[PDB]
Design a protein around this ligand. Structure first.
Ligand SMILES: C=C(F)[C@](C)(CCC=C(C)C)OP(=O)(O)OP(=O)(O)O
Ligand SMILES: C=C(F)[C@](C)(CCC=C(C)C)OP(=O)(O)OP(=O)(O)O
Ligand SMILES: [Mn+2]
Ligand SMILES: [Mn+2]
Ligand SMILES: [Mn+2]
Ligand SMILES: [Mn+2]
Ligand SMILES: [Mn+2]
Ligand SMILES: [Mn+2]
Lengths: 543, 543
């Protein structure tokens, strides 16, 4: 008379999330940490090999040390750019290095630099195709395959650079390889390019690969390790706070049709918000992703059509008086939601001088609504086309909701315009959103539909063009490619109104969705080995 | 060009407040405690002498164990009640004993046994006046003086008994040789009768008095002291919590002007809610008393007349949309105030299954508006007549807000109907409110109005009858006298719709009120020794 997608219970118990009594939770560490930051800062500014700095830049970044070295990352690339005239689209053709040019291409464009597609030009035969000689330089080769991910629609060279590269990386790995760890790094990124590969939940493996590295420096290896632990401690801190909240809602028992995953739900933010200083944003998001998970279960599992429409609309008119009029589980949910935006908007009014409640409120509302059109089809047995779906999709998934919540806390000051521009669900918001969706849709879907939910994109795909599932998979993979391109531009600006740290969260959501839904089982639903990176980046300390 | 209270900061430090944490939170602790109940109970129930059985319920109470010995106290008095026949309309001749009759009359009436006034008749003489021959029995005379506080206009005999024992008790005290330290127990209740002595912030002394008591029982003394500590700890826990809330409002820095006295604001609740199990009622109440303190400041000190007519109103219409147009300091106060009722209400909705938000809201609205009426008399010339003031005061002293807020936490179940009876503001609520007030006015007054405010009773009485200050202080003391009677009556009442505990806190706020405002200003600022009382029932352990 009610359904329930049978999600099992959170593999992490209270007493654990409460025990979690860290260790590098105290200063002496960071003083030490912050004391190497300096040696490394200048082993950095001391080096002269530009390609070396590039190499060390890329490394510091794959290990989450990126927070210290920020304006260094900038002085260095600023320079290389200029002292290599990377600006000009018109090429000089020093035949340049494939490896050094791709590496620098990559970090420059990432660090927002204008670096013409035509840079890789001097590596083409006169047939205009890529140079089949290059076929052997695979350090470089692997690295060009890695700069491609930084393109935009209308950048064939890049688009075919990725093609050539993959094929050779491919074979090289396919045969016994001209190494062993090469064989793996090639596959590691042939599984996910660094550009779509989210840092923080991954630093560890890179940390020890650098450890096993020769050239390798310790001031580094070790600075890398300490900081690593200095934040983990901290995550744990934000962790409890969010838990502490979860527990109070007692949805855990009072509204349990709902998957419980406060941890998974806080773990996303471990990637979505990489700049350590935005803690409250991560805490607040532990709870926001949570309220989402529950409101979505209410929509695609539990609640009925009457029940939903009613909920939907009271939300719409944020009618806390009629609070008691909807079923009982929709009261406690609704009030906990009104309690969350109100306590959250208090902290923003409190610490930034602004009444943000009309917005986080909207954020919720729209999210609610779109979850509604998804019931309706499904309940009303309407099955939509790929576009109808893809259109609700990028919002029902909650991307803007979480992403708009995040803006008020990563950015330090905004104007009403910056704000309204955002709430268009500014393009940025829609593209990182699409990725989380397309990736999420590509992960779930089978069960989304099976234990109830409207068809997903692969699904509407295969009905649409009437295709094989593979066909849909490929299609939807492509879609992701395409919006990443869309996103690349936007993030590297549009005279984007969005500040630094914010847009990066936007980009990082699309990134974390790709880890989270890379082998499957939701943002935790049934957790494959998403359970490893999790206990590894949240609980288990480093060597 | 905004007045200021001329206030000092919480004498207690956050890092202290935050730290303090005591060893007795360790279970085995109360276990010991709970092995002694079993035997002090044992000693109790096995007692034979009924006058020793009463002297024990009385200590078990004043010493704080009143909680684990409940269903015992009942049997021992239903037994003395019935046996000694106190439920009869007559019986005397000239034969009961003074100390036992008074002692047993006090406990039975306290416990709501009906024990007619005429009992003390048997100690009267020819003229229908207390036999002077009694001028001697002082353990007796003291016992009587003290049971005269359990009367009800009706009761002249008790009113005329209050006199007897007081005069000769003064004698006995002016004579340093009647004993010496009894001379101090005598004057102790001569200052505040047991009937109007909140227990909890008073146990310590009783404890060591019982301790030096010759006849004393050490397992009692033992159970006694261990409990004191096991509950002072739970206080501290609650303390931190309501603190933790305080720190968040950030009123300290943002709504400076109002006094910061949160441990005081909690200490209050150390008397109002004596049954240990109401832990939340006391946490929630730390936060409530705080908002009251503040909102009160906002009215009698910072806020302007337009700025208050405004606050007053929006809260009355209660809406966080036009929250946008109050002064920034009134957006923060109104929003956090809303958040609290919303939070508190989510708790009651969580646990008790009901939406109490439209009532706590209403508690807050009426409190506000009475703060307004006074604010208009201030700004708007008017010096009310001693009765118009008295009719607003008992409401403007927060009183009902405090209590109504409380009813919901201490009452497992209820009915719209008894809620409503409550919310018209039952007499039960009114009388205790009254005590808190008059005790306040009697105490506060001075800087209250000199440093700007409306005339408190002391003052309207003087103006009114053009009287010296004694008279008015006397009148008020006499008034406290009367509402207390009206209070005995309602607490033992007929069909009070309130439960033991609740009606309990109603008379207990009047008691706590007579403590804080007994040495002047109490609450927070002057609190003379009022600090050694807190420092002692919140931080400083026993033996
Ligand atoms: C509640 C959802 F939106 C999740 C669990 C993922 C997003 C929640 C985060 C980022 C904390 O996916 P789900 O598959 O349940 O959404 P769906 O109902 O659109 O399929
Ligand atoms: C702190 C206040 F707000 C009080 C103590 C009144 C009520 C607060 C309590 C009971 C802890 O003092 P105040 O003298 O200003 O009361 P009044 O302004 O209503 O006369
Ligand atoms: Mn779902
Ligand atoms: Mn859904
Ligand atoms: Mn899904
Ligand atoms: Mn005042
Ligand atoms: Mn006042
Ligand atoms: Mn006062």
């Amino acid at each position: 008379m009610r359904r329930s997608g049978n999600y099992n219970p959170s593999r992490w118990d209270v007493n654990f999330i409460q025990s979690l009594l860290s260790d590098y939770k105290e200063d002496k560490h960071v003083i030490r940490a912050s004391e190497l930051v300096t040696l490394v800062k200048m082993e950095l500014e001391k080096e002269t090999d530009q390609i070396r700095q590039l190499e060390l830049i890329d490394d510091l970044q794959r290990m989450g040390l990126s927070d210290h070295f920020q304006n260094e990352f900038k002085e260095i690339l600023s320079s290389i750019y200029l002292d290599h005239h990377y600006y000009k689209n018109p090429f000089p053709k020093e035949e340049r290095d494939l490896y050094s040019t791709s590496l620098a291409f990559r970090l420059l464009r990432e660090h927002g630099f204008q670096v013409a597609q035509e840079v890789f030009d001097s590596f083409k035969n006169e047939e205009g195709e890529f140079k089949e000689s290059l076929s052997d330089d695979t350090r470089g080769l692997l690295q060009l395959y890695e700069a491609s991910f930084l393109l935009t629609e209308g950048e064939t060279t890049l688009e075919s650079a990725r093609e050539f590269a993959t094929k050779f990386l491919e074979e090289k790995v396919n045969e016994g390889g001209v190494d062993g760890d090469l064989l793996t790094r090639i596959a590691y990124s042939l599984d996910i390019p660094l550009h779509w590969r989210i840092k923080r939940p991954n630093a560890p493996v890179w940390i020890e690969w650098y450890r096993k590295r020769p050239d390798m420096n310790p001031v580094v290896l070790e600075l890398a390790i300490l900081d690593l632990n200095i934040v983990q401690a901290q995550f744990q801190e934000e962790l409890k706070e969010s838990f502490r909240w979860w527990r109070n809602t007692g949805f855990v028992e009072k509204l349990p049709f709902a998957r419980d995953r406060l941890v998974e739900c806080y773990f996303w933010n471990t990637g979505i918000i990489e700049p350590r200083q935005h803690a409250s944003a991560r805490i607040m998001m532990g709870k926001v992703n949570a309220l989402i998970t529950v409101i979505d279960d209410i929509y695609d599992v539990y609640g009925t059509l009457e029940e939903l429409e009613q909920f939907t609309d009271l939300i719409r008119r944020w009618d806390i008086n009629s609070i008691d009029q909807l079923p009982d589980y929709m009261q406690l949910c609704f009030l906990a939601l009104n309690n969350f935006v109100d306590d959250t908007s208090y902290d923003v009014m409190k610490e930034k001088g602004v009444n943000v409640i009309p917005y986080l409120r909207q954020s919720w509302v729209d999210l609610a609504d779109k979850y509604m059109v998804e019931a309706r089809w499904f309940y009303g047995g309407h099955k939509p086309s790929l576009e109808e779906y893809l259109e609700n999709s990028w919002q029902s998934i909650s991307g803007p909701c979480m992403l708009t919540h995040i803006f008020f806390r990563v950015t330090d000051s905004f104007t009403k315009e910056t704000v309204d521009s955002l709430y268009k669900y500014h393009d940025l918001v829609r593209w990182s959103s699409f990725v989380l969706r397309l990736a999420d849709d590509l992960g779930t879907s089978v069960e989304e539909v099976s234990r109830g939910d409207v068809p997903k994109s692969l699904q509407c795909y295969m009905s649409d063009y009437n295709a094989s599932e593979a066909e849909a998979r490929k299609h939807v993979k492509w879609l992701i490619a395409e919006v990443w391109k869309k996103m690349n531009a936007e993030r590297v600006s549009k005279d984007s109104p969005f500040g630094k740290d914010f847009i990066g969260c936007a980009v990082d959501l699309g990134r974390m969705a790709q880890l989270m839904y890379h082998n499957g089982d939701g943002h935790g639903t049934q957790h494959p080995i998403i359970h490893q990176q999790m206990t590894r980046t949240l609980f288990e300390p480093f060597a």
